[PDB]
Amino acid sequence: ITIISASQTGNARRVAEALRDDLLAAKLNVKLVNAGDYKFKQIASEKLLIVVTSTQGEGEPPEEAVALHKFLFSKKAPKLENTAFAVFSLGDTSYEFFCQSGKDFDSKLAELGGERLLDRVDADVEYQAAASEWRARVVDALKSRA
Ligand SMILES: Cc1cc2nc3c(=O)[nH]c(=O)nc-3n(C[C@@H](O)[C@@H](O)[C@@H](O)COP(=O)(O)O)c2cc1C
C-alpha cells in the first residue's frame, strides 16, 4: 500500500503516519511518501493507493503536490488501469474553497477511471476525529479490499 501525504504545514503527514502504522499493524508492506518526493510517473503501478492532501490559498493544491495534481490534470495523465484509491482532506469551512484539493484529486482520479475504495473525506479545522474515523475505515476496507 502507498500512502501519499500533501501538507503545507505537516498535518496530513502526521495522519498518514498514523494510517501507515495502522496498516503496518494490519498487514505490513506500507510505503509512506510526500507528494514532493514521490516519482509519481509510476502512480499507475499502484494496486492500493492513499492520498492525504490539504487545500491552500485560493483553493490551490499543496505545493508538493502541484506537479502531481497538474500531471494528474494533464492530457498525459495515465488511466488508473489497476489502481484503487481513497482521499482524506484537511480544510477549513471559513474559506470559500473549503477542501477543494480533495475534491480535485477525488474527481480527476475517478474521471481517469480509478476505483474509489472509500468516499472522499473532507475534514474541517478540528481535523483530528475525521483522520481517526477515516483511519479506522480504510483499515476495515483495505482488509476487505486486498
Ligand atoms: C495560507 C493557507 C490557506 C489555506 N486555504 C484553505 C482553503 O481555501 N480551504 C481549505 O479548506 N483549507 C485551507 N487551508 C488549510 C487549512 O484549512 C487546514 O486544513 C490546515 O491545517 C492543513 O494543514 P496541512 O497542510 O498540514 O494538512 C489553508 C492553509 C493555509 C496555510
Swiss-Prot record:
Domain Flavodoxin-like per the UniProt entry, residue ranges: 1-139
Residues annotated to bind FMN: 7-12, 54-57, 90-99
Domain of life per record: Bacteria
Oligomeric form and interacting partners: Alpha(8)-beta(8). The alpha component is a flavoprotein, the beta component is a hemoprotein.
Similarity comment: family membership: Belongs to the NADPH-dependent sulphite reductase flavoprotein subunit CysJ family.
Protein function: Component of the sulfite reductase complex that catalyzes the 6-electron reduction of sulfite to sulfide. This is one of several activities required for the biosynthesis of L-cysteine from sulfate. The flavoprotein component catalyzes the electron flow from NADPH -> FAD -> FMN to the hemoprotein component.
UniProt protein name: Sulfite reductase [NADPH] flavoprotein alpha-component
Lineage: Bacteria, Pseudomonadati, Pseudomonadota, Gammaproteobacteria, Enterobacterales
